[PDB]
C-alpha cells in the first residue's frame, strides 16, 4: 500500500480558514495544528468548542490560540514549555487550556483532511 503516519498537522492555512474547516466538521473538542502565515517560527492551536454561537444549529465556536516557540520548544502565554506540538497538545488533551474569559478548551480528537464516503 503506502507508508505514512498522518497526524494533526495541516500547515498552510489562514485564520478565517481554520474556522470554516472546523465549524464544518461539527465536532466538539476538535483540535487541529496548522502553520501560521509567514509567521516567524510560530504556530496555532485551533479547537472547536462544544459551545454553539447561538443554539442547536449554529457553527460551534473556534478557539484560536497562538503557540509561541522557545528554541524549538513551544508555550502558550505560560512559563512552561513542551518539546513540540505533540508534547504540548497531548498534555493539553488530558488537562485542557484555560481562557482568561473563563472557558476550558478540550481536545478529544484532532481534525483530519480526507473523508472516505462521498
Amino acid at each position: 500500500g503506502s507508508s505514512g503516519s498522518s497526524g494533526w498537522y495541516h500547515g498552510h492555512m489562514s485564520g478565517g480558514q481554520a474556522e470554516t474547516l472546523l465549524q464544518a466538521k461539527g465536532e466538539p473538542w476538535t483540535f487541529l495544528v496548522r502553520e501560521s502565515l509567514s509567521q516567524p517560527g510560530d504556530f496555532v492551536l485551533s479547537v472547536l468548542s462544544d459551545q454553539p454561537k447561538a443554539g442547536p444549529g449554529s457553527p460551534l465556536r473556534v478557539t484560536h490560540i497562538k503557540v509561541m516557540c522557545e528554541g524549538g520548544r513551544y508555550t502558550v502565554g505560560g512559563l512552561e514549555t513542551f518539546d513540540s506540538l505533540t508534547d504540548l497538545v497531548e498534555h493539553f488533551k488530558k488537562t485542557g487550556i484555560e481562557e482568561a474569559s473563563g472557558a476550558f478548551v478540550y481536545l478529544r480528537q484532532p481534525y483530519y483532511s480526507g473523508p472516505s464516503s462521498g
Partner: peptide, 15 residues
C-alpha cells in the same frame, strides 16, 4: 469588506 483576521481567546497564565 475582508476578513482582516480572527481574535485569539486570551489565556490564564498570561496577564
Amino acid at each position: 469588506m475582508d476578513n482582516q483576521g480572527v481574535i485569539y481567546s486570551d489565556l490564564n497564565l498570561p496577564p
